[PDB]
DNA sequence: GCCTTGCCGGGTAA
DNA sequence: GTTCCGGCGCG
DNA sequence: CGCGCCGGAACTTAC
DNA sequence: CCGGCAAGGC
């Protein structure tokens, strides 16, 4: 607080499009990574990185933000035991998120993997328990939604946000000004 | 008539 | 998105 | 000696 | 993620 909104939003982006990795090497070497992947260097270097930078600074984390180019996407990586655990421990507590963290998380998750055309409002994931948590948050915010198994090939569910509540979902979650990068 | 949403394969962006 | 790789830092 | 950062990239597949 | 198709609702 109020790094907690930005944290929740980055967790959305990490859960969606990145990951939390604990490596073991030959030995007894190790590494802890916080990862967001994305195709464009804008929205990585210009939107995501400074949000991560802010948090790293607030949390006193000694590690660099690394931006590594791949053939198919960019990777924002923080190599840091402290931040790995910061985000992993937060994920464990996800059910206790307040409204601020709820909205920020759902915003980052949608950015990761929502339907971008917004002709339809859809979030895709294999993690059904995760989408069921988001579904209950959305019901509490008055945004009707259903979950079903969308992709039978990959075991990938969709949470479809009802277009009845289109304006409420876009207003309240997607174009939310909550917790900006910071005045 | 017009809108919404399940279904389901392609392949890009994870 | 995930996990290999070689290499360096630091008490 | 015993782990934890850095920079990359091959390898796979979930959006 | 994208997007065409067709069922089904008002
Ligand atoms: Mn994902
Ligand atoms: Mn994405």
| Domain assignments of chain A as residue spans, ordered by start | 1-97, 98-183
User: Which ligand is nearest to the Cα of residue A37, counting in written order?
Assistant: 2
Q: Are A131 and A125 in contact (CB under 8 A)?
A: yes
Ramachandran area for residue A144 (φ above 0: left; ψ -120 to 50: alpha; else beta): beta
| End-to-end Cα spacing for chain A | 15
What CATH number is given for A98-183 in this structure? Answer: 3.10.28.10
What is the rounded distance in angstroms from the CA atom of residue A127 to the CA atom of residue A117?
Answer: 23
Closest CA to A24 of A14, A32, A13, A36: A32
Which residues in A69-89 are b (16+ Cβ under 10 Å) and which e? eeeeebbbbbbbebbbebbee
The answer to whether the CB of A104 falls within 8 A of the CB of A6 is: yes
Give the Å distances, CA to CA, from A135 to A3, A132, A151.
Answer: 24, 5, 19
For chain A, counts of helices (H) and of strands (E)? 6, 7
CA dist A24 to A21, A32, A63, Å? Answer: 10, 9, 18
Helix (H) or strand (E) holding A110: helix A99-113
CATH code: domain A1-97 is 3.10.28.10
- The Å distance, CA of A99 to C1' of E8, is 35
Evaluate whether A19 touches A11 at the Cβ level (below 8 Å). no
Quote the strand ranges of chain A, DSSP E.
18-24, 30-38, 65-69, 74-79, 121-125, 145-151, 156-161
Q: Which DSSP state fits A114?
A: B
Confirm whether any atom of chain D, the nucleic acid strand, is less than 7 Å from CB of A126. Answer: yes
Task: Return the residue matching tokens 């490596």.
Answer: A23
Alpha carbon distance A144, A74 (integer Å): 34
A17 C-alpha vs ligand 1 centroid, how far in Å? 5
CA distances from residue A151 to A85, A145, A148, A155 in whole angstroms, order as listed: 32, 18, 9, 6
- CA A120 to ligand 2 center in whole angstroms: 16
**Strand D, CB < 7 A, residues 2-31 of A:** 16, 25, 27-31
Nearest by Cα to A142 from A113, A173, A101: A173
Tokens representing A28? Answer: 């007894």
């Amino acid at each position: 607080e109020n790094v907690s909104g930005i944290s929740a939003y980055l967790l959305g982006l990490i859960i969606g499009d990145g990951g939390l990795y604990k490596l073991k090497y030959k030995g007894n070497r190790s590494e802890y990574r916080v990862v967001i992947t994305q195709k464009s260097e804008n929205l990585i270097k210009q939107h995501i990185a400074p949000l991560m930078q802010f948090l790293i600074d607030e949390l006193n984390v000694k590690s660099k933000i690394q931006i590594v180019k791949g053939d198919t996407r960019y990777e924002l990586r923080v190599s840091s035991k402290k931040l790995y655990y910061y985000f992993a421990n937060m994920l464990e507590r996800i059910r206790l998120f307040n409204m601020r963290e709820q909205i920020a998380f759902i915003k980052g998750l949608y950015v990761a993997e929502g339907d971008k055309t917004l002709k339809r409002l859809r979030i895709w994931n294999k993690n059904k328990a995760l989408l069921e948590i988001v579904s209950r948050w959305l019901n509490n915010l008055g945004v009707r939604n259903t979950i079903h198994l969308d992709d039978h090939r990959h075991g990938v569910y969709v949470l479809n946000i009802s277009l009845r509540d289109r304006i409420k979902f876009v207003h309240t979650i997607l174009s939310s000004h909550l917790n900006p990068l910071p005045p």
